[PDB]
Amino acid sequence: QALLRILKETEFKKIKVLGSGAFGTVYKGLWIPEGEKVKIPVAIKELRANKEILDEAYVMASVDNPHVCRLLGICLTSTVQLIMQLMPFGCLLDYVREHKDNIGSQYLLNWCVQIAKGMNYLEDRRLVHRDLAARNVLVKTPQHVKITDFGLAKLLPIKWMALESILHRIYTHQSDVWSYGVTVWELMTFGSKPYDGIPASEISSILEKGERLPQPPICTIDVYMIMRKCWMIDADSRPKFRELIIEFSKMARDPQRYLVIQGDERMHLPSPTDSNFYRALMDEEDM
Numbered sequence: 001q002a003l004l005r006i007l008k009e010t011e012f013k014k015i016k017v018l019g020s021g022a023f024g025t026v027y028k029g030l031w032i033p034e035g036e037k038v039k040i041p042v043a044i045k046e047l048r049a050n051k052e053i054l055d056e057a058y059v060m061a062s063v064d065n066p067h068v069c070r071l072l073g074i075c076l077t078s079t080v081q082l083i084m085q086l087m088p089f090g091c092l093l094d095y096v097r098e099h100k101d102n103i104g105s106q107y108l109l110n111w112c113v114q115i116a117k118g119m120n121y122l123e124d125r126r127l128v129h130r131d132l133a134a135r136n137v138l139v140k141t142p143q144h145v146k147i148t149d150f151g152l153a154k155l156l157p158i159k160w161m162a163l164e165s166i167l168h169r170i171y172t173h174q175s176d177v178w179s180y181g182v183t184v185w186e187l188m189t190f191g192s193k194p195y196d197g198i199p200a201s202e203i204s205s206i207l208e209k210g211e212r213l214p215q216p217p218i219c220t221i222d223v224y225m226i227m228r229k230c231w232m233i234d235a236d237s238r239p240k241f242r243e244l245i246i247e248f249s250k251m252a253r254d255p256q257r258y259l260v261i262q263g264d265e266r267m268h269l270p271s272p273t274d275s276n277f278y279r280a281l282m283d284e285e286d287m
């Protein structure tokens with residue numbers, strides 16, 4: 001395909017390590033096009049059957065949405081190194097932790113809109129994410145986040161999975177809606193760990209008995225009810241992503257009534273001069 005570039009070992013180098021998961025290790029790298037002197041920053045994930053890999057990979061490189069990250073290139077040899085575009089701000093989970101007092105309700109609600117927009121695109125393409133979490137939402141600019149780690153799931157998180165995924169390994173677009181709720185909960189708690197102190201082996205036990213994540217202190221009841229319907233036992237009773245896009249888009253038009261944060265009227269707001277400046281330098285895709 002013309003979308004997944006197959007790279008040689010000799011045309012890219014790992015430079016600095018950025019993080020790891022229980023799947024692979026993410027490096028900041030450099031691509032040196034053959035015959036050129038430039039060095040282009042890329043992100044590289046070295047994972048811990050080659051045809052199966054390439055096939056799932058083509059499926060990945062076929063995502064064309066402003067809020068979904070595209071797999072750009074691959075190098076199948078010693079280890080499976082995956083190449084995508086570098087996001088200098090990092091993952092959305094770390095971003096809300098380092099800035100846990102200077103994030104206003106306009107940003108948080110718009111992030112919820114965009115993640116749902118990206119998830120809705122995955123459902124239209126009939127692709128199940130399987131690993132949605134704040135750690136797997138990247139920040140391109142503060143005004144533009146993107147969902148990442150799409151396919152790595154099958155190519156290779158108890159507290160984010162739905163009960164039916166935990167009990168029966170059933171992953172559907174509605175179990176992704178459960179995962180979306182936990183991702184939204186994480187953002188409204190500024191990066192708190194869900195079920196902190198609870199062993200992962202016991203989560204399905206507490207889920208069956210009716211307990212859910214408690215109400216974050218900044219959430220009104222309108223926002224918390226959306227998160228609670230995402231955790232209904234009946235998977236067909238959970239909201240659809242298209243319904244979530246509409247609901248968070250409404251609340252983003254009056255952020256102060258649905259989120260109570262201290263100084264929200266003193267926090268930075270996306271400026272047109274600022275949004276145009278970010279676009280010309282870091283974010284030229286369509287939107």
Ligand SMILES: COc1cc2ncnc3c2cc1OCCOCCOCCOc1cc(F)c(Cl)cc1N3
Nearest residue numbers: 018019043045084085086087088089090091148149
């Ligand atoms: C500025 O720092 C970063 C820039 C990045 N640019 C692009 N992609 C990244 C980046 C990760 C960074 O580090 C922050 C913390 O690490 C994040 C650990 O979990 C998120 C991993 O999600 C991925 C999945 C993948 F398949 C591929 Cl290929 C790449 C990434 N991650």
